[PDB]
């Protein structure tokens, strides 16, 4: 399981979901994360507006807004739900980038997400059973 592949495939899906095209055991994790992110986004929007509208995204502030939100997300701890929240948040930034006519920002966001996965989330993930444990945990929620 390679974290850069995981990020690129997730972002690709999030964008194709919106009508935007953007350039097997491992397949199981991608497909599971797909459904978990869609389920997260459904629950989120039931309680809140479309996340996209509460961003105030600009090319100048994009990295600082990414780092501030993600730092606070994981400040008091990690769990699989917060990791799912991290992937959806990064997907929303990518989607909003395309919407607001800054599509090259997507490539930076994907890099920031890979960096954060490799540098700050890799330890908890490995200590907690790896991605196979996410697949195991999310199993009964698949539809």
């Amino acid at each position: 399981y390679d974290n850069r592949e995981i990020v690129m495939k997730y972002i690709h899906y999030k964008l194709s979901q919106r009508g935007y095209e953007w350039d097997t055991e491992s397949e199981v994790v991608h497909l599971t994360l797909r459904q978990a992110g869609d389920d997260f986004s459904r629950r989120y929007r039931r309680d809140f507006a479309e996340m996209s509208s509460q961003l105030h995204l600009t090319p100048f502030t994009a990295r600082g807004r990414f780092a501030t939100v993600v730092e606070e997300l994981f400040r008091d701890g990690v769990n699989w739900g917060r990791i799912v929240a991290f992937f959806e948040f990064g997907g929303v930034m990518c989607v909003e980038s395309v919407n607001r006519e800054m599509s090259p920002l997507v490539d930076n966001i994907a890099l920031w997400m890979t960096e954060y996965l490799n540098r700050h989330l890799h330890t908890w993930i490995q200590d907690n059973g790896g991605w196979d444990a996410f697949v195991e945990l999310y199993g009964p929620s698949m539809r």
Binding site: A36, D39, F40, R43, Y44, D47, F48, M51, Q54, L55, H56, R65, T68, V69, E72, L73, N79, W80, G81, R82, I83, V84, A85, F86, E88, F89, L137, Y138, P140, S141
Partner: peptide, 22 residues
């Protein structure tokens, strides 16, 4: 408002974590 966004993400994430975990 980035704090507002982060706390909304965390609450949904923890909810998601509780629900999918039994």
């Amino acid at each position: 408002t980035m704090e507002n966004l982060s706390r909304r993400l965390k609450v949904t994430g923890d909810l998601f974590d509780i629900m999918s975990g039994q």
